[PDB]
Design a protein around this nucleic acid. Structure first.
Length: 173
RNA sequence: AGUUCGGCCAUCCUACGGCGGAAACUCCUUAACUCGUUCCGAAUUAAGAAGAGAAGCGCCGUCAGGCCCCGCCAGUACUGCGAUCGGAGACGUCGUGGGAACACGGGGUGCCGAACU
C-alpha cells in the first residue's frame, strides 16, 4: 500500500549562495515520514546535501483517478547478496501507486529484496503496442477468455464454517 | 627612498638572466700605533678617502623548483550510536549522526614599529 508524493528541497541559504537551487523528486512511500527520509537519502548521494545542511519546502500528497487499466514499466536497481543489478519490469494496474505495490511484492517473493534495498529509477506508462513482457502482452489483446483459475477456493472457504456435510460438494466450472 | 634597532619567522627561500646609486650602505686603500692570526692584516684590530656599480644590496623577469590560498577529489574512504538485517564463515547491509587524504585544476609570491637622513 503505497502513496505518491512530490517533495521540494533546498540547501539553506549561505553568504556566498544567497538563493540556492531547488530540487524536486517523486517518491512512493507508505507515509510522509518515510517519503522525507527517502528524499534526503537520494539528495545526500546525488547532490552532497545532508538533512542537517538543508530544508524541505513542501511534501504534497497526490491522489490519482483509477478507472481504467494501464500498462506500467518500472526501471529499478537492487542489491543482492553478491552485488547490485539493474532490472526492468512490466505491470498492469489502474494507478501508479498500485503498480508499485505489485512490483514490491514480486521483488520480495522472487528475489528476496526489501523496501530499503531497492531504488526506483523511473516509472512510466506504456502503450499496448510497445509492451516488452509476454504476460502483459497476452493480457492486452481483445476478446481474451479463460476459465476460472482456482474454483476450488470457493468450496474450500465454505467448508470452514460447515464442518460436517452430508455429501462431498462439487466444483462448478 | 636609505640606514640602525626590532616583531611575526619562505606569499620572505633557492637557481638563473636583467636594471640602478645623488645621499645612504657597501665594496675599497694603508700597517706607525692598538690588537691579531695551529702559518697568513684571509679573518679580526687600528688609521684613512684615490677609485666602483663589477659584486653584496633594492627592483624586474622565468608555460622556474619550493612555499601559500581556493576548488575538485567526495559525501567517496573511514567512523559514533541502534538493528533476531544477509551470510557456514570471511565479511557485508539498513536506520540515525560525523566526515578525510593523495592526486589534479586555478591563482598568489612580505607586512608591521621607533628613531635619524
Amino acid at each position: 500500500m503505497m502513496q505518491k508524493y512530490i517533495v521540494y528541497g533546498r540547501r539553506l541559504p549561505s553568504e556566498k549562495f544567497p538563493e540556492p537551487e531547488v530540487f524536486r523528486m517523486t517518491i512512493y512511500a507508505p507515509n510522509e515520514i518515510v517519503a522525507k527520509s527517502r528524499f534526503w537519502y537520494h539528495l545526500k548521494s546525488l547532490k552532497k546535501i545532508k538533512r542537517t545542511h538543508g530544508e524541505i519546502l513542501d511534501c504534497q500528497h497526490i491522489e490519482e483517478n483509477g478507472d481504467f487499466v494501464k500498462n506500467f514499466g518500472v526501471l529499478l536497481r537492487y542489491r543482492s547478496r553478491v552485488g547490485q543489478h539493474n532490472m526492468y519490469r512490466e505491470v498492469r494496474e489502474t494507478t501508479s501507486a498500485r503498480a508499485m505495490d505489485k512490483v514490491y511484492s514480486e521483488m520480495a517473493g522472487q528475489c528476496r529484496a526489501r523496501y530499503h534495498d531497492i531504488q526506483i529509477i523511473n516509472v512510466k506508462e506504456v502503450a499496448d503496442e510497445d509492451v516488452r513482457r509476454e504476460k502483459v502482452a497476452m493480457f492486452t489483446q481483445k476478446g481474451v477468455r479463460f476459465p476460472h483459475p482456482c474454483p476450488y477456493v470457493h468450496v474450500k472457504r465454505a467448508a470452514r464454517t460447515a464442518r460436517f456435510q452430508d455429501r462431498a460438494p462439487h466444483v462448478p466450472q
